[PDB]
Every structure is written in C-alpha cells, then in structure tokens.
Amino acid sequence: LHSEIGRLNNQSLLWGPYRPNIYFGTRPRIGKSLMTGLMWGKIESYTDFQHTVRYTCEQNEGMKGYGWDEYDPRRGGIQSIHDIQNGLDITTSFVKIPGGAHGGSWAARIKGTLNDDAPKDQKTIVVFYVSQEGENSELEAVPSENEFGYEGDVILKGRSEALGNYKLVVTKGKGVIPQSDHDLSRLRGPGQTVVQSLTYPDEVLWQAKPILFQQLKAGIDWLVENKYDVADPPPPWQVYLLANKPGSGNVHIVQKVFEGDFEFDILFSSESAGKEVTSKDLEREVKQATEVFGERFARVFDLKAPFQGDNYKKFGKSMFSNLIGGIGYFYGHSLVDRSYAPEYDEENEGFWEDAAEARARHQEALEGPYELFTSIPSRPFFPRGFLWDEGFHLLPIADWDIDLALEIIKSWYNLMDEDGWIAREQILGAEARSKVPKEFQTQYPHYANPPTLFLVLDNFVERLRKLDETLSTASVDNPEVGLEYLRRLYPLLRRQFDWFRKTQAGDIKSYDREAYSTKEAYRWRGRTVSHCLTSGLDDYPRPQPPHPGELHVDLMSWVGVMVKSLISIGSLLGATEDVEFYTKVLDAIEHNLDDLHWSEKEGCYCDATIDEFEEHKLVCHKGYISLFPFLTGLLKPDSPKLGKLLALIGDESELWSPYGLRSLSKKDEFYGTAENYWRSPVWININYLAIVQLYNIATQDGPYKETARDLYTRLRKNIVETVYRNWEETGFAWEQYNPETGKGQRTQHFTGWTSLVVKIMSGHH
Template sequence: MAQIRQLSLAFAFCWLNALLFAAWNFFITPAAAAAADDHAESVLHSEIARQNNQSLLWGPYRPNLYFGVRPRIPKGLMTGLMWGKIEGYADFQHNIRYTCEQNEGMKGYGWDEYDPRRGGVQSIHDTGNGIDITTSFVKVPGGAHGGNWAVRIKGTLHEDSPRDQKTIVVWYTTQEGEDSVLEAESSDEEFGYDGDVTLKGQSPALGSYKLVVTQGKGVTPKSDHDLSTIRGPGQTVVQSLTYPEEYLWQGKGILFRQMKEGVDWLVQNKYDVQDPPPPWQVYLLANKPGKGNVQIVQKVFEGDFEFDVLFSSESAGVEITSEDLTREVQAATESFEERFKSVFAPKEPFDADKYTKFGHSLFSNLIGGIGYFYGHSVVDRSYAPEYEEDNEGFWEDAAAARARNLQALEGPYELFTSIPSRPFFPRGFLWDEGFHLLPIADWDSDLALEIVHSWYNLMDDDGWIAREQILGAEARSKVPAEFQTQYPHYANPPTLFFIIDDFLDKLFKTNNGTRSASASAAAADIHESLATASLDNSEVGLEHLRRLYPLLERQFQWFRRTQAGDIKSYDREAFSSREAYRWRGRTPTHCLTSGLDDYPRPSPPHPGELHVDLLSWVGVMARTLSRVAGALGLEEEQETYRGILAAIERNLDDLHWSEEQGVYCDATVDAFEEHQLVCHKGYLSLFPFLTGLLPPDSPRLGPLLKFLGDEEEIWSNHGLRSLSKKDEFYGTAENYWRSPVWININYLAIVQLYNLALQDGPHKSTARNLYTRLRRNVVDTVYKSWEETGFAWEQYDPETGKGQRTQHFTGWTSLVVKIMAMEDLAPPPAGESVRDEL
C-alpha cells in the first residue's frame, strides 16, 4: 500500500499544480493561461516519465544469459548466473551454463510468467546436467535508484540423476565506472563462508547498495582428502578481481581462467595422482574476498539446493529480505495470472487450460526477453558512389565498395529493446520490433512507448536507423564479422509505425470513455497505473506524439529520398510520378533489407526495379503520419499525408497489379526498357492487403482471397506458405522465405481477414471462412511444436508443421497470444473445405 500511495501522491502533486495554475488562469490573460496549462502538462509528463524510469530501471536485461540482472544505465552493476554438474574432471568445462545456446540439450527454458514492473518465474530444464533450475525474480520500488530486487535460485535434480550429484553454482557480479566501488566483506572462516556473503558497492548512478548472497538450503559436500587443509569443505567462496572494463562481460572466460590458475597450482604443489581429490574440490576457487570490479561467488551443492540473492539500494530506506522475496513472488504470480486473463484471455477453441499455460509461456518469454544494450556500433559512412546502385551490375560494384572495409566504430549508443531469440539473436532488429511490441503494448502501453522512444533516439540527422543494432563487444560476439557493419543507405520495414497506430487507437478509445470499470479499478495498483499512464492522461499521450512526430517525419522523408524508385526514366504509366520505391542492398539471390531475405525477386537485379512491399510500407508510414498530424491538430500536414497515401494506393494498382495473375507483383524493365511485372506469388503478392491499404470494396480482394486460400498455392494446414507451391523457386536453395510458414505474416493476414469478415460486402463470408481456418491452423501448429519440443521456433514446415531454424524464437512467433485472444467467428460447416468456399 505504501508503494501505491507513493505513486498516487506523486500524481496528486502534479494535478494539484495543474489546479493551482487553472485557478490562477481565471485572473490572467488567455495566452498566459495556455502557457500555464502547458507547464502543468509538462510537469505531469515529467513525473510519469520519472516514475516509469524508476519502475523499469532494473530487470533481467541481459537476455543472452540464462539469467542476468542489470540496470538501464550505461555504466552499471551487471550480474549473471552460472552452473554445471561436477561429477568428473571434464564435466564442468563441458557442462557449464551461462549464455543461452541452441546446442546444450535443453528441454525448454524461459519465463513461465513475467511482468517487467514486478518480476516473475523462469524454469530451465537442463537435461545435460540432469537438473531443473528455477529463478524467481522480483522488484520492490522505492528510493531514487529503482528500489530493491531479489532472485531465488533453486536447483532440483531430475529423477534419473544420482541423489548425491554435485553441482557448482556461480553468481557473477561486476561493477563498471571509474568512480565506483565493489567490495566483498571478509569471512570469519579461513577457507570460505559458512553463512551469507555480502557485497557492498557504490557508483554515481546507483548510489550505495548492498548485495547479499544467502547461505541458502542444500547439502554441502565433504571431503577427507588432504586438500581440505587448503580448500575448505565445500563452503561458499569469493574471489575479488580487477579487470579492464572491456573484459567484464566475459564471465565464463574469467571464471575458467581463475579455475585454471587454481588447478595449475594444485598440480605443481599438492596433487597426488595416486590419491586424487574429488573433482568438485579441484575446481573450488581459493577464497580471496576484497575489493574488485569482478566478484565471483561460488557454491558447491550435493543434491537439490536453493539460495537467494538480495539487492538493497540504500536510497530505498529498507533492505529486502528472503521473507519479502517469498511474499513478492506469490503476489507477482497472482497478479500475472489475473492480468493475463483480462488482457489475453484465449477465446474458443483455445480456452482450455493447456492453451493458457502455452500463452503464459510465449508472452512471458517475449516480454522477458527485453534487454538493455550499450556500446559502439560498426557503421560504413564512406558514402561510396557505388552505394547509389544506379548502374546495371550495381551489386558487384557495391560488394567491391564494402570490401574496402571503410567501416568504423560509432557511438556509444544505448537501446532498450525486445529481441527475437535469446540464444541466436540477442540484439535489436528494427523490423522485428514492431511485431514484438504489438502484444507488449496490450500489456503495458507505456513500456512499449519507452522502447519506441529508445529506437528513435538512435536516428541520425538524415533520418536513418540501422536495421540491426549490434551494440558493444558482447553483442558482436554473437554475430559473424561479415554481418556486423551497418550501412546508412540500407532501409528496413518501418514496423514501429504499427505501434504508433495502435497507441492512437488506444488513446482515442480510452479518452472516449470506453475503458472498462474493471480496468480502471485495476489501475489503482502502482504497476498498472504506470502501464497505462499515457493513455489515462490524454495530454501526456499527446505529448509522446508531439515528441515522436518530427522523428517519424524525418524517417519518412529518408525513405522517400534514399529508397526512391524510377518511374520517369522508363516512361511508366502511373497516377503519381513520385510514389515508387526499391530496396537498396539487393543481390541476385537476396534482399536482406526487405526482411524477406531470399524471397525471389526480379533477376538479374536492375536499377529500374520497383518493389511492391516497399511501396506498401511507405503507404503505412503516410497513413500513420496523417493520423498523428490529425491528433495534434495539424490539419494542413494531415491533408498532405492523405494525398501521398492516395497516390500510393493508386500506384499500387498502376505499377504492381497483374490482372493475369490476380496478385500484386514486383516490377522491373525488360530488354526494351519497358515496364515488366515479375510475379513470384507468395507473401509479396499480398502486401497491399496485409498492410491494410485495400478498402473492403476493392476489386482486387476477390482474386487475392482466392489465391490466399488455394491449397495449390500458399494455403497449408499449418498456415500460409511464404511462397507458392507452383513457383519455380519453391523450397530451393536456402529455403528461408521460399516455403516455410512465418507467424508475423500469418498474423497480418489473420487481422485483415478478421476486419474484412466484420464488414458488409461481397467478401464477408469468404473472409470469415478463411479467418476461422487460418487462425486455428496457425495456433495449433505453434502449440503442438511447443508441446513437443519445449520451444517456440523461428518458422514452421508447411507440410509437417514442425518448428525449424532458430530455437527459442519468442519474438514475433509470440503473436499467437494475440491470435488466441481474437474473437472466434462462427465456424464453417463440418467438412467444408477452403477450396469449396472459394
């Protein structure tokens, strides 16, 4: 209750200021009154921003680790968990867990429930080590540095594991910053700690703090070996070290180095091959606590175990305890379950308990995969003339320019972002982010806005945002060198505009009084008050839009300038001579910048190409900018963007519609330099429909729906295929976007079919049929694979439905949570096929 009062008082103070200004305005001029209103709104916006920053300061923002906590600040405290069984001398080297990896034999891992403002519970099913690890993390707000936090780490052996199996567990802590201090309090015992371990720290950004690693519960192994005289009986030990900051993130390497030093010393001084000590004792570090920017806390357990890590900020005024942790974990679990029911309650036929557990897992791993990244980015700003891509054979010239290796480090930059996959893609991706934020915005609109602002803070003066954010050495360690460099002429689908659109929808609904009474009552809770603060206070919401609007405009103009297509040179007939676009960065086999990597395009590439998906994305941007301008009262700008959108809609038909194929297609020029459509039917063919640019009475909808539902084209029992079965490139080469089912595109199709099914018109019945079947196919495909493997996957086989490619892909695959929560429209008659309906 004290926490709720704290937030309520803060908001009350802001509103009291506003009322005082309003009262004063009664006696002053209208201009002065308006200025006073603006001031009051600014005060409220600043207070909400401050509270948001406090609420979201700490978190498991190192998603590349199985568990690691850090704050959203550049130079901060970073922690990480390591563990591994130690039955043999080679065990720990091969079985230690730290960074998430695809090849470690996990039977699933991730958050069972998670809310970034409260915490949650993560389960890790480690078959290789024969143990399940549970991390229960909570945050308690208070003070000036994000409050306190705590985590309970519990290990439970599998039934087929030896009951006396030994496990080494390491809590790894580092503190960055020249003016920072981190010190381990000394132990009363010579060889380690029989009780808790206390680390005390201080930094300019975090103030003073204490981190306690409790003794916990579990059997400590014993040894009668002579080594016990210098390496204690399995007690907790601490090594305090000082390393250059650029190496601090390499926790596993530093631990191995310290272990090797200890083993080498034993071999030289104490080791008797005729009487070897037990492996766990060999790998037990010497106890050397003290000051150091690296603190390694090491424990050895026999059998099951449990211990807590308790972080207390001095500014919070009270230290967190294990009893607090127990209580807060229970409260976080109950809160999550209730909120999930209200936000993502699965609708028929997905209202069984098994789907609820499935939904909890996918959404929690999406929102629990949010990370904070800080560091330099690799950028090529040479602006080589070859990058203009104006000549035939331009991809070869561009490759030669890239080979000159004119890239350099820029920054440092910071980014708060969700990620596609913890083991394989632990970094920010521009076109993925908009899909990620759709479910996150339903749960916590202000958190989604924090992430949107973070992305736009990366924009350069021209309006460019790098499509892949690989910030710092730790992030680069997961990326092959040839993919690290970013190029300021490369675009990426601007899916963040989806989130601006979504925020506008929510803002209008909330302030038209459509928010439910239960939702308003729930907002009395401090966490939910912050989650919807920018919706509940319309002026705060509009202030977000005012700050974002010039950045959205700058990005839009960058797209129009750098990705422009050529209409005039080839005497093309189109409503507008301006609205046509092509992706830069093309090669004969790939268009990575489009997001659809190896999807077939016109071959060979040509500077006269036009890409239907890119024109659709620019249409999405124009539509959103028109809406934002309208919300901000910028009527002239609203009309300008409406005009651009109308021209794009006309040009989609003029430049990209194939009457013969009944779909939209990319365009190029033939040997006579005349306009030519190149139709590789698949996701690309649907883009004007997928992005909502076709009105319900469009004459193009009939042919498109027929194509969409054709089982010989892209329809399958597991979702829409990325490429038609009839295409010559179906399933060939890398087969990345050449047959597999992708959930983000299927989600867009489901939403548009749903919208069409609710509107009167010639396609209502067909859309309802397709919506119902596609919704079921997609959810069942992802669910069955998750149930079988323990993971969500990057893509799904259109013939078998099996998950494939990247494991633990809880980015846009998590959109199934929104799909399950969509309305179940009346199912079609039993036995009726999609082909019959069409």
Template sequence: MLQWSWRLIAPFVALLVIRPSIAEDVQEILAENANLSNETLLWGPYRPNLYFGVRPRIPKSLTTGLLWAKVDNFQDVQQSFRHTCEQNEGMAGYGWDEYDVRLGGRQTIRDAGNHIDITTEFVKIPGGDNGGSWGVRVKGTPRDDAPARLITTVMFHAGMEGFGSLGVQNEPDDLGIEGDVVLEGNSNELGDFTVRITTGPDTNETPPNAHPSSEKKPLDRTYVASTQVPEEHLWQSKQIMFSLMKGEIDSLIAEYGQDHAPPPWTVYTVPNKIEEGNFHVIQKVFHGEFEFDIMYSSASAGTPLTSEDLETAIGNATASFSDRFSEVLAPKSPFRDQRYDGFAKSMFSNLLGGIGYFHGDSVVDRSYAPEYDEDNEGFWEETAAARARQAGVRLEGPLELFSSIPSRPFFPRGFLWDEGFHLIPIAEWDMHVTLEIVRSWFNLMDDDGWIGREQILGAEARTKVPQEFTVQYPHYANPPTLFLILETLIDKINSQPTVLPHQHQYDSIRNVHLRNKDTAIDYLKDLYPLLKRHYFWFRKTQRGDIKSYDREAYSTKEGYRWRGRSERHVLTSGLDDYPRPQPPHPGELHTDLISWMGMMSRSMRRVAETIGETDDAQEYEGYESAIIRNIDDLHWDDQAQTYCDATIDDYEESVHVCHKGYVSIFPFLTGLLPPDSARLKATLDLISDPEELWSDHGIRSLSKKDELYGTDENYWRSPVWMNMNYLVVKALYDVATASAAKNPHKAQASTIYTKLRKNLVDTVFKEWERTGFAWEQYNPESGEGQRTQHFTGWTSLVVKIMNMPPLSKAVVEVNEG
C-alpha cells in the same frame, strides 16, 4: 537530480514544462508515475543473452549473472558450464513461465544435459530514491533421470563498470565464507547498496569429500574470489571465471598429482581471494536439490531485503500476473482449454522477459560510396566491391537501446522490423513500456533520418554476429513496423474511456498515455520531428525510377525499391531470399516496399491529424492516395491476378516478375485494400488455395506452384512465418467485421479467418509441447519448428492471435449465406 533518474523521467517532466495548460489531475498523474517509472523499469533481467543476468538501464554500472555446471566427473565438466543461452546445450526447454516487466516473475531452465532444472524467481521491490531493490531465489531440482550423486556448482558474478566501487564486506578466509556473503557498492546513479547471497535453507546438502584437499576446500563453505578486470572485458564473465579456476586447478594437481587428484567438485573452484577489485565471484557446491537467495538492497530504500520479503514479493508477483493476464490477454474460444493457458502465459512472458538494455559502439560504413546509389546495371557487384573496401567503416557511439529481442540464443540484439511485431502484444499489456521502447529506437536516428536495421552495440553483441553482417549502412532501410504501434496508440486513445479503472498494480503507469489523451498527444508531439525526418529519409533513399522507363502510373514519384540487394538476397526487405527479378536491375520496383510506404504515409497522416498538424496531414494524405493508386498501376498483373514486383527487360520495357507469396499479398497485409476492392477476391483466393499459399499449418511464404518453392536455403521460400500470418489474420478479421455495405467478401474472409487462426495456434502449441521451444518458422507440410529455437520474438504473436475475438459459427454461417 541524478543522471539516470533524469533520463527516465524526462518525458514526464517535459510534459509539465511544455504544456502548463494540462489539467491539474493530469499533472498529478505524471508526477506520480515519473517515480514509478524509475522504480519499476530501472532494474531487470536486461541481459537476455544470459540464462540469467540482471543489470540496470544505466550505460556503465553494476552487471550480474549466474553460471552453473555438473561437476560429478571429469569427462563432462568442461562442456557442462552454462552461462550464455546457446542452441545446442542439451536443453529440454527454458524461459519465463510468467513475467511482468514491472514486477518480475519465474523462469524455469530444463537443463537435460546436466540433469537438473534451474528455477530463478526474480522480483522488484520499490522504495527509496535510486530505483528500488530486487531479489532472486535460485532453486535446483534434479530431473527424473538424474544420478543419485548429482553434484552441481553454482556461481554468481557481479562486476562494476564505470565510476563506482564494489567490494566484499566479509573478512577474508582461506577456507571460504561461512554464512551469507555480502557485497557492498556505491555509484553516482545507484547510491549505496548491498548484495547479499544467502546460504539457503538447511535442506541444502554438500557432497562428501574424504580427500585430504577437504582441509583446504571444505565444501560447506562459500568460495569468494575478487579480481580487477579492464572495464572493456568485464562482459567476458565466463572466461574470467575459468581463468580464476585455472590457477586453483593447477595448484591442486601440482600438490596431489594426476593419480591422486581431488574429486572434480573440489578441483573446479575459484580461489578464496577477497581483495579489492571490480569483479567478484561467489561459488557454491551442492549435492542434489538446492536453494539460495540473492538480494540487492538500495540503501535509500531503508531496511535491507530479507528472504521473508522476497518470499512475499514472489507470491504477490505470481498472483498479480495471473489475474492481469486473465483479463488482458487470456485465450479466447476455441482456446479456452486449460492446456492453452500455461502455453499463452509462457509465450508472452518470454517476449517480455526478452527485453534487454544494450549499450556500446556500432560499426557503420560512412564512406557514402557512389556505388551505394545502385544506379548502374550490375550495381550489386559494384556495391559488393565497395563494401569489401571498408573505406569508411568506423565505430560510432556509444549508443543505448531498450528493446525486446527476437531470440536469446541466436539473436540477442535489437532488430528494427522485428520490434514493431514484438510490441503488438506488449502494447496490450503495458503501453508505457511499449512507447519507451519506440522512443529508444527513434533516439538512435542520425541527422539524416536513418536508423540502423540491426543494432549490434558493443563487443559482447558482436560476438554473436558473423563479421560480414556487423557493419551497418546508412542507405539500408528495414520495414517500418514501429509505425504500426503508433496507429495502435491512436486507435486506443480514440476508443478508450476518458478514465480507465485501476484494476491492478501499476495500471496508472502502464496506461498513462491512455487515461488522458493529452499525455498521448504530447508524446506524439515530442516524437513527431523524428518521425517526420525518418519518413522523408525513406522517401529519398528508397525511391524507385518511374519516369526513365515510361511507366504508366497515376504518380511519377510513388514507386520504391529496396537498396542493399544482392543477386540472391534482399536482406533489407526482411524477406531475405524471397525470389526477386533476375538479374537485379536499377529499374526494379518492389511491391512490399510501396505497401510499407503506404502504411507509413497513413500512419503519418493519422499522427499529424492527432497532434493538430493539419497542413502536414493533407500532405501525407496526398502521398497515401497516390501510393494506393500506384500499387495497382505499377504492380497489379491482370494475367497472374496478383501483385508482382516490376523490373526492366532486355528491350527496356517495364515487366512484371510474379512469384506468388507474401510479397503478392502485401497491399492486403498493410491494410491498403478496402473491403470493396476489385483486387480483394483474387487475394483471398490466393491465400486460401492449398495449391498456392494455404497449408494446414499457416500461410506459406511462397506458392507451392512456384518453380523456386523450397529451393536453395529455403528461408522465405516455403516456411510459415508467424509475423506475416498475424498480418493475414488481422486483415481477414477487418474484412470479416466490416460493414456489410460494399463488402461482398465477408463470408470468405470469415471462413478463412476461423480456420487459419486455429491452424496457427495448434501448430505453435504442438511444437512447444513436443520440443519445449517456440521456433523461428514452421514447416508448411509437417508443422515442425525450424531454424532458430527459443524464437520468442514475433512467434509470440500467437498469443495475440489466441486473444483475438472468435467469429461464432452463427456469424460465419450468416456471412456465407
């Protein structure tokens, strides 16, 4: 069996080998879906840092991408080339209008700076033994404000990493290629394949060119350039193409002089140079609107793809996505208005379309410096000095990760705590893809149980990260949000019918873990050793000190402190600049971390119960119970009527430091406050108070009354964040719908839930309409989007919020009465 095929289907095959007792129908399901997994997940636009780039989930293989520019004048051309997603390129919005990770979809790039809208319609076509084929239709449509003579150059590049070949099938021609351009290649994993770039329909026009250079550069041809590039530099596609163009520019200027230079659309071209190489550029020049196809055909699939095949597949993908979305994630009241439909589809599609495959080495500090224990007062200065030494910094790997990213222009890489939030809506759409991503993260774990919180794999990924943030530290944690997904899986297998209907294409593979409980149990059994190792790594490395300071608590062991804090930041908590005790102290205990540990313990208990590890389940239940008791004992402040971080004062006494905000409500956010909790009323009051956390645009990260509200970098000191607000909405819904017995807070929770849900959706929707983007955070006063644009990671949770059940007015009134 081929290497890549084995890696993708191994989880299915393992079930057949390990558990021969599985019913025959389950074996048939697994066998059927092993091949479907290869065909539907091998290829994708898994280079989300590019506006469009396709690659397979193979460490070293074929990589492709698209680049374009406006070339109608010399003044703007240098700044007009588009390739990697950037924040400040004059975009009026871009992203996937509809996208299914198994079928494909349509992306629209509204390039206001270049006066053109680019559409990429990408689809996968199953068939053969090597992961199927794929195609993309590229269209350009001038925008309303485009000049009459809008001239655009478009380049498609393809490179082959590792062992394999890639060449141009066409015969060399100094004037360029007439007709389609065909690349042919081969690798162990992909077998034989071709990539055809078509001329497109007759409506395509080329710009006029009366210059003598037109005899050497006829614009109705396609230019093809080949070159050999060191493998480690193949990702630098734009620089390679600029290098190829430079020689052509220099020769044209030398021949005709500056005063009689050819027009820019002739100058900014690659040379016609077809030869052996591992990198090939295919360039076209268009006047006005244009269209052409790129079709990858696996030889093992039989007949190569045609433009007619592509047309049919695009139509099928669109119809399938719309039908399935209306059943799985359609907005519910009060968001049934048609204007919300395209918004919801776009937000979710960009979350799925942000899934990428990454492969490369990681920079890790393995010095295990004693300063990293953070046991001394002034520890943050000692750890800063230890980090500056870089004594144990080294490259590790290579590693590979299948992950949905937070933001294509700014954070095109894997973030551990972001991922759990990303997967909440994805789990509704495709549980199998969700669990593939979860497995991919846990496969990164080292022998101690550590997973790097930020996965910056390879040189290309490191170009997007300031140098001071590239090094990962094996004592740094991150909120364990992936355990939320494991609980979602358990909830679903306990509530789903034994057999789910096949309503849509690939439902059998999407729901393979839900259609039969044995498949889910075997997945959890396979993952369980890694879950256990990671859980106990958390308990060991993020421990807090209770005994040394005579703290009164139910348990002397269940207290926790984030490692890796500086004077102003706790980056490892995910809440960065959220106010913490000052100055830092080794005796600190953090409310959010003990809450995460409570959630993690509950999740481990439920996993152990599900797979029959009863002794382990009892052990986790003990931890869970002790943590819940200690949250009150260590963190509840009677005077402030909220949960607070703890530290040690000048008299060596444990004291609370209360900054009301997200940290204060963490026991509620993580589901650790039951409906009849004595602390719940004060928590709900804090959330709903407009002088504290409530705003018309969502729950603020910090109270308006806090002296640090809106200060310094103001990252987590006032803005509204959608991931935290989703947890608030879900927790409110759980209280509002809990049994009336011992639930005196149903009315208040119902009212807050209904108002907050609408505020959040309207805030994100209005900014999406106004700016064309989702944003990293939102201003609590104005609702304006802030920081990173095109932040379609956890901000896409708005889709899940829209899909949550409404509480009817009658229900709210009954609760209030």
C-alpha cells in the same frame, strides 16, 4: 505531468533480468553499472566442468528447454531451465521491490532439483558473478569470520553515482555441501562458499567465463607447485573450488558446491529505500507477482473459442512470457560503414558487383556508444534488436503494458541518425559482437527494414481516441501525456518517412512508365542476385537480374502504412500543412499501386523491373509479396482487387496449407528451391497480418464480409493449432512451420514474432 509519468516509468523499469543472452543475470538500464550472472555445471571428473558449465544461452541435445513461465518487467517473474547434460531442473524467480531514489531493490531465488536420471550424489558447482563498471564506484566483499570461506551469507557493499549506496547478499542457501578429508583441507578448508574479489579493465568485465577459468587455472597451477599430485589427488570439486580472497574490486566471484538439490537467494537492497530486502520478503513478493500476472493475463489475453481451455491458456502464458521476458538492455559501440561510397547508390546495371567492391574497402568503424531497450527474436541464436521484428514483438507487449511498448519505441527512435536512418540490426558492445561473425556485423546507412513500429503506434492512437497497473496505461488514460509523447516522436517519424523517400526511391521518369504520380515508386537498396535482406523476406523471389529499374510493391505498401500513421498523428497534433502533403502522397500511392504493381492477367500485385528491351515488366511470384497492399490495410473492403486476393489466399493449390498461408505458392517455379526460407514455409508474422485484415473485412458491411469470415475462422485455427501442437511436442516456438508436415523448423526459442499467436487467440482486433 509528462515529466512525472516519464520519471515514474524510468524508476519502474530501471532494474530487470535485462541480459536475455544468458540463462540468468541482472543489470539496470545504465550503460556502465552493476551486472550479475549465474553459472552452474555438474563436476564428475578433473576435466569435465569446462565442458558442462552453463552461462550464455544455447539450444542443443544437452538442453531440453528453458524460458519464462511468467514475466512482467515491472514486477519480475519465474524461469524454468531443463538441463539434460547437468541432470538439473532449475528455477530462477526474480522480483522487484520499489523504494528509494535509485530504481528500487530486487531479489532472486535459484533452485536446482536433480532430475530422475542424475546421480543422487551429483556435485554441482554454482557461481554468482558480480561486476561493476564506472570510474568513481566501489564494491567490496565483507570478509568472513571463518579462515577458508563462508559458513553463511556473503555481503557485498557498494556505491556508484547511479545506484547510491547498496548491498548485494548471496545467502548460505539450503543443500548438502560436500566435505573433503584430503590434506589440502588444512589449507583450503574442507569445503565452503568462497569469494574472489578481482579487478580487470572495465571493458572486459562481461567475459565472465574466461575471468572465472583464469582463476580456476591459477588454483590448479598452485596445487601442482605445492605437490598436490596424482599419487594422492583431492577430489575434483575441491580442485575446482577457488581459494577464498574477498576484498574490493570490480569483479566478485561467489562460488558454492552442492551435493544433491540446492537453493540460495540473491538480495539487492538500495540503502536509499526502507529496510533491507530479506528472503521472507522475496517469497511474498514472488507469490503476489504470480497473482497479479494471473489477473492481468485473464483480462488482456482472454482466449476466445476454440482456445478457451486450460491447455491453450498455459500455451498462451508460455508464448507471451518468453516474448516479454526476452526484453534486454544493450549498451556500446556499433560497426558502421560511413563512407557513403557512391557504389551504394545502385544506379547502374550490375550494382551488386560495385557494392561488393566498396565493402572490400573495409571503411566501417566503431561508433557510439548507443543504448537500446528492446525485446528480441531468439535468446540462443540472435539476442539483439531487429527493426521490423520489433513492430511484431510490441503488438502483444502493448496490450499488456502500452507504456512499456512506447518506452521501447522511444529507445529505438533515439538511435536514429541526422538523415533518418536506424540500423536494421543493433549489435551494441563487445558482449553483443561476441555472438556475431565479424563478416555480418557492419551496418550500411543505405539499408532499410520494414517500419512495423508504425503498426504499434497505430494501435496506441486508436486506444488514445476511444501504481504498477496505473503506470502501464498512464499514456492512454492521461491524453495530455499521450499527445506529448506523439508530439516529441512525430518529427523523427517524418524524418524516417522522408529518408525512405530520399534513399529507397524507385525510378519512373527515366523509363517508358506512365502512372497517376511521377513520384510514388520504391526500390529496396542492398539486394544481391539471390537476396533482398532489407525487405525482411530474405530469399523471396524478386526480378532477375536485380536492376536499378526495379519497383517493390511491399516497399510502396510500407510507405503507405507510414503516410496513414502520419495522417492520424499529424491530425492529433494539428500539423495541417503536413497532413495535406500526406493526404496527397497516400492518394498517389493508392493509384500507383494499381498503375505500377496490379496484374489483371495474374489477379494479384507484383514487383516490377525493366526488360532487356528497357520496358516496364511485371514479375509475378504468387506469395506473401503478392498480398502486401491487403496485408498493410491499403485497399477498400469493396475493392474487386481485394476480392481476387481473397481468392488467391483461400486457394489450397496456391498459398492455403492446412498449417497456414505458404510464404510462396506451390505453383511458383521457385517453390521449395535454394535455402527455401521464404520460398514455402509458413511464417507467423505475415499470417498474423492476413488474420487481422480478414477479421477487418469480416466485421464490416461489404461484398466479401462472409468469405473473409470463413478464411479468418479457419486461418486463426490453422495458425494457432500448428504453433500449439509444436509447442506441446517440442516445448519451442519455431521461426517457421513446414507447409507439407506442419513441423517447426529453423530457429527454436523464436519469441520472436511466433508469440503473436497469443493475440491471434485473444481476438477482437
């Protein structure tokens, strides 16, 4: 029965628009298979299309905005693109039609509407680019009846082991096609849909822009050789129309020129299913996917006061759809230093210098290949898997579709090496590497990242204890299936738990340190003078100088999150001998949090170092870090320590801004300093943790119930309204929010954990 739900999930999720790095394209969850990409650009001149053409996601003054209005990876959805440079409002509707033995069929409608400022006679070039990777696989453009190109549909017929037989149709579409009266039209035709079928070695098929431009440049060279010159030049749009040469190959370029508004369909028909997919099929399946998305949202994301209104429902749909619509499939080699150089052990003073020397050996090599199926923080700036971001992404996604969330968790845990290491940053293949400076690619096996994926596993278990609709909950509705997943995953959770304990161990025994436990103490590896990249709070102030004797209260608190999850899961599995050791590790963390990290002087938890005089010193920087034992749910609701943290959180002079909790206190000496990344701005992921914990204390018998209730109510409001106002004004989710002004700053299209705001509005944690 596990195998069945497994095979059904596989078949449901195989196809998607799983290329979030580009405006619009498709691929299945298969490393070497059939992929598609959309390109468009106005052409006003002989030189402008190279600069106007769109393919990979960016955000600049030329683009107003873009994203998913509606999305479910099982059904498809609708994306809006507002392109100022090209004068176009584009719609890409994508739909899946289940059937056959191969992951089903799918269809897309591309619609371009010139905006008010565009010339009513603008010529827009549109390209649908189709590649197929594989040794024993074929794809062929059925040639046209016409001499120079296509009056109607373009039929591609192909086959692979993975997809069996399929056909891919690009329809005639609707819109005016310009006609050239030039002598060239006797040889190129007056203007029509064209296809070039090419082959390149499989590993470069992703470089669709250079592949296209090489063909455009060969056309222009041909014009020059055959005496088409500046005395009598063809119009720009004919100069940039490829000579029709359909055939077989692993690349198929389908090119259309439109004058004014346009639309055209892409129909993917799996032979192994019923009848082929039609345009009338696409139109209906789209209408129905909208109805279903509407119905699921109103149940799953029931927005509570004061966010019940339609304005906030639109907001919620946009923030959610962009989050789950960012889901990608990633395949290829990753860059890794497997030297395990001894300098990476960071056991002497000045360890950052030694670590730099080891990195300068440049022993890192390509390894894999790996696949990953994950949501992403940002399509334009960093469209790839980030380990602790994914824990946040999956909290809303899990509500929507717990079986999808568990699929993504599983994909992340299949990356884990023999030691219990997952790389914090997953850059799989040359396409992914294209977006990342060479200096920032190398993953380090000694680099951790917060294990936020356990928070998701926690929600799963809580839900476990208490056809597309069916598949989405299959793993909570069929408890036998739920436990089998946990049984298969548990060992790797344990492996990661031990890996933290072997690789991110702090040192008690070697210093004048007393504590309830000689074991429980942690220090993030990878830290430099200014940074602790691995903690996730890049420039949050830490002990200066960095020191082998440091202890990180956030890191211990994450180990605390991990043990509590292992207790829950281990028990659901009856692994008694493990639960005992976990029950005892937790007990030791609860104590050592107080003995090593609690400041009675300051009224908050702090990190620790050892002095110039070699004694344990608390290093207190009031901010996110200070709150961690609370944010991670480790303290008793009656704890006096919780009492003092609630005071700090609610204190306007420290953390409390009209716009949410400041990453760092206004009273801290480092407030607003340096890159000021985690040194003041409001981050939605940490505010989300605060809101959830406040609500927990707020709905419990205890002394702080009423304070917790006030701070919840107000913080929920401040966080939602800040993200809303900025979305209303800019159309973007932002990476962080200015505490002085409330303005969105840093990375746009951050969906991204800023999308947690849909869960903050829906309440009932």
